[PDB]
């Protein structure tokens, strides 16, 4: 009867729906939801979005809350805990610590150890004859080390692939059972509940021990309170930069003549940055926001309870507000990308995001000849995570 969500483009070609719904009159087209059967509202248009995602009676923490209209097959939160996000740490009167730990004096921090490492990494695959994989010996190392050293503290090994997994399980449409997911934030609460301390408390400037020792106004913070802050911390910053970073390199690696440009002009490479983060699609899924009031969009009723969506991919390929939108074109010159989102929910850790893409981009510009050791047909994908990632990256030079 009705289109049904999500669209199963795991990979990067997008769905062709998203383009269907872009071209609809509507800037807002109905979506039933797979996992709930909640009806929907989704958006796919620059126009609209831009109204949509700046409207304060659109609320981000409605569509969070358990009962909302929603497009995932579970509470993406343990059992028992809040899991409101980043709102907790509002409450607590955290908003110069999240400034100093995400904020323009934290890129001054971390950058750079960021950029000598994605050198060092890519200066080791030089040295392989053949074939290798990008997404393991290239995008987990760095990832980690950011997550560690920016966010968490230092993880063991193990640790690190505990939290990998259990975003990985959870944050998905299909694939696993819902009892799996269910107990991936579980099993994510319980090991910060148990080492959010420690964590804290070991040498660096992350986050996280940030969170610890601030002195919250008439308060201490819970160790019930950090635990659901690092769970978020690895939600928000893992998975995102883990799929980001790998889809950024397919991109790179199918645009030779665009890299060697980079290559010739340094000066250019913070601009391909902006572009990789309108043309790369990572979620496959849409940033939402439920009415809390009535409202009209171009012709169209939201009613109170009703939940709108807007795909970022959907409108970082819209023609009508990038010209040759599905064109990887450095240079362009257009209206700001919707990658880390907009208006008040603008993604905070955006500029370490940012930060390590460039230092990615400049280690793929200072060694050309990288190449995909195979067709990007015959490239193998994750299903059913919310954020895009292919399963390895064969890669020669
Ligand atoms: C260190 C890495 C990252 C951290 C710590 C981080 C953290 C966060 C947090 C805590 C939020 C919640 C904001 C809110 O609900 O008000 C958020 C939102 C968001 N982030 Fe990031 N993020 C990171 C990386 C990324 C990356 C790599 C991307 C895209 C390539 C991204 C795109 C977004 C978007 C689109 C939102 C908007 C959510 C919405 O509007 O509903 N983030 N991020
Ligand atoms: O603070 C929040 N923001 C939004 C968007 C988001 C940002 N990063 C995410 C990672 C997974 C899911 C959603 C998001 C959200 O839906 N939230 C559920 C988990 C974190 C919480
Ligand atoms: O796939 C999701 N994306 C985020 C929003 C988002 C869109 N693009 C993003 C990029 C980074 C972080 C969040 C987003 C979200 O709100 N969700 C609710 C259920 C699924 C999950």
Redesign the pocket.
């Known amino acids: 009867a009705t289109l049904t969500y999500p669209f199963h483009d795991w990979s990067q070609e997008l769905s062709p729906r998203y383009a269907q719904l872009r071209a609809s009159d509507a800037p807002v087209c109905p979506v039933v939801s797979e996992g709930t059967g909640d009806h929907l509202w989704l958006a796919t248009r620059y126009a609209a979005a831009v109204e949509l995602l700046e409207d304060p009676r659109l609320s981000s923490e409605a569509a969070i809350a358990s009962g909302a209209p929603?497009?995932?097959p579970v509470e993406?939160r343990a059992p028992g805990t809040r899991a409101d996000g980043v709102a907790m740490l509002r409450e607590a009167g955290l908003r110069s610590v999240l400034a100093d730990g995400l904020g323009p004096r934290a890129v001054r921090r971390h950058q750079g150890w960021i950029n000598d490492l994605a050198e060092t990494l890519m200066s080791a695959l030089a040295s392989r004859e053949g074939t290798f994989d990008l997404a393991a010996d290239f995008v987990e190392p760095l990832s980690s080390a950011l997550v560690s050293r920016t966010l968490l503290g230092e993880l063991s090994a193990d640790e690190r692939d505990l939290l990998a997994h259990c975003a990985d399980t959870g944050?998905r449409f299909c694939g696993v059972t819902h009892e799996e997911q269910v107990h991936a934030f579980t099993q994510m609460h319980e090991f910060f509940l148990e080492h959010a301390r420690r964590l804290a408390g070991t040498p660096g400037e992350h986050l996280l021990k940030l969170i610890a020792e601030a002195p919250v106004d008439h308060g201490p913070l819970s160790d019930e309170a950090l635990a659901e802050a690092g769970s978020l911390l690895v939600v928000?910053g893992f998975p995102?930069s883990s799929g980001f970073l790998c889809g950024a390199l397919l991109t790179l690696l199918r645009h030779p003549d665009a890299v060697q440009e980079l290559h010739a002009h340094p000066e250019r490479v913070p601009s391909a940055v902006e572009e990789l983060l309108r043309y790369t699609p990572?979620?496959?899924?849409?940033?939402?926001r439920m009415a809390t009031e009535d409202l009209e969009i171009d012709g169209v009723r939201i009613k109170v309870g009703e939940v709108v969506m807007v795909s970022?991919e959907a409108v970082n390929h819209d023609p009508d507000a990038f010209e040759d939108p599905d064109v990887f074109r450095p240079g362009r010159e257009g209206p700001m990308h919707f990658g880390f989102g907009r208006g008040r929910h603008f993604?905070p850790g955006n500029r370490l995001a940012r930060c390590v893409i460039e230092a990615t981009v400049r280690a793929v510009a200072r060694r050309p000849g990288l190449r995909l050791a195979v067709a990007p047909e015959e490239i193998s994908w994750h299903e059913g995570l919310?954020?895009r990632r292919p399963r390895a990256i064969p890669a020669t030079w």
Request: with cysteine; proline share 0%; aromatic share 12%.
């Open positions: 929603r497009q995932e993406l944050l928000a995102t990572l979620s496959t899924g849409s940033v939402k970022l993604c919310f954020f």
